[PDB]
Design a binder for this molecule. Structure first.
Ligand code: HEM
Length: 180
C-alpha cells in the first residue's frame, strides 16, 4: 500500500481558516479494504511561526474505544501541508509515548473555508506507508459540508458517495480533550 501521490496543498489558502476552531470528520475515504473498523475523528490544529501542534482524537466505532495523540510538525514551504511526529497520550494528555523519528503523518489541506475543509492524511512508519485517508471536516458535529468543499472532493478526482459518512456510526467525541 502506497499513500495517494497526487497530493499537494491548495495554493492561496488562508491559514487562519484552517487553524481555527476544531474539526470533526463528517466523511472519510480509507483506501485499505483490510481496515474493516470504522472511525470517527476530531482534532484541533494550531500554528505558530510555522510549527503546527494539534490534539488528535480517534473513536473506533465498532469497538467503541477512543485513542489520543498530539502531533507536532513544520509547515512546508508549499503551503498548508506538514509532516508531524506525534506523542501518544491518555485522555488527560499524560504522555504514554513521546514522539519518535520513525513514526509520522503527513497532512495536506486541499480546501478550507469558513465552515469546512478537505484534508489528506498519510500515516507512515519507517519506509512503510501505513494508512491513507481523505477526510471532509466541519466545525460542528454532523454539520453539512460546504459546497466549495464538496467541489474540492470532485476536484481531487474522488466521489463523495464513496466516502464513509460518520453520522451513522454512533460517534462519541471527547470535546474536553480537543479544547485547547
Ligand atoms: C475518520 C477519519 C479517520 C479514520 C477513519 C482514521 C483511521 C485510522 C486507523 C484505522 C488507524 C490505525 C489504528 C490502529 O490500528 O492503531 C489510524 C491511526 C492513525 N491516524 Fe487516523 N483516521 C482518521 C483521521 C485521522 C486524522 C484527522 C489524523 C491527523 C490529523 C489521523 C492521524 C493518525 C495517526 C497519527 C495514526 C497512528 C496512531 C497510532 O499509531 O497510535 N487520522 N487512523
Amino acid at each position: 500500500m502506497d499513500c495517494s501521490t497526487n497530493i499537494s496543498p491548495k495554493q492561496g489558502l488562508d491559514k487562519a481558516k484552517y487553524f481555527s476552531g476544531k474539526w470533526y470528520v463528517t466523511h472519510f475515504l480509507d483506501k485499505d479494504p483490510q481496515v474493516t473498523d470504522q472511525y470517527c475523528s476530531s482534532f484541533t490544529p494550531r500554528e505558530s511561526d510555522g510549527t503546527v501542534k494539534e490534539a488528535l482524537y480517534h473513536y473506533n466505532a465498532n469497538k467503541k474505544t477512543s485513542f489520543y495523540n498530539i502531533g507536532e510538525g513544520k509547515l512546508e514551504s508549499s503551503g498548508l501541508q506538514y509532516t508531524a511526529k506525534y506523542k501518544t497520550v491518555d485522555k488527560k494528555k499524560a504522555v504514554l509515548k513521546e514522539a519518535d523519528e520513525k513514526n509520522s503523518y503527513t497532512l495536506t489541506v486541499l480546501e478550507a473555508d469558513d465552515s469546512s475543509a478537505l484534508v489528506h492524511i498519510c500515516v507512515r512508519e519507517g519506509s512503510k506507508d501505513l494508512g491513507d485517508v481523505y477526510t471532509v471536516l466541519t466545525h460542528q458535529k454532523d454539520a453539512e459540508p460546504s459546497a466549495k468543499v464538496k467541489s474540492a472532493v470532485t476536484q481531487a478526482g474522488l466521489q463523495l458517495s464513496q466516502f464513509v459518512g460518520t453520522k451513522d456510526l454512533g460517534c462519541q467525541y471527547d470535546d474536553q480533550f480537543t479544547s485547547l
